[PDB]
Amino acid sequence: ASMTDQQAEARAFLSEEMIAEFKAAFDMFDADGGGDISTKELGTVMRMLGQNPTKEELDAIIEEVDEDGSGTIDFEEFLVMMVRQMKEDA
Numbered sequence: 001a002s003m004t005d006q007q008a009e010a011r012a013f014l015s016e017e018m019i020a021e022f023k024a025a026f027d028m029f030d031a032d033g034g035g036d037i038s039t040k041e042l043g044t045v046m047r048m049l050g051q052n053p054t055k056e057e058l059d060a061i062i063e064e065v066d067e068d069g070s071g072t073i074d075f076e077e078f079l080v081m082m083v084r085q086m087k088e089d090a
Contacts, residue, residue: 010080051085
């Protein structure tokens with residue numbers, strides 16, 4: 001899919017330092033994923049970080065990153081959901 005592109009540019013848009021910030025924050029819901037929280041909790045991880053994922057929008061991303069055959073979201077693949085939304089708050 002064309003997501004493999006926004007997966008590397010989603011975290012590269014900033015310095016690796018920030019990525020470490022989303023670690024303790026993104027892992028806040030990785031009690032059973034470790035490197036990926038339930039797509040349902042994908043709105044709180046990016047929202048509690050300082051952004052605001054809308055349901056209609058958060059739903060399009062989940063179903064989009066959920067059809068990968070995993071059911072949840074990956075850290076690197078989730079980054080896009082961070083900058084893409086922070087693009088306005090940043």
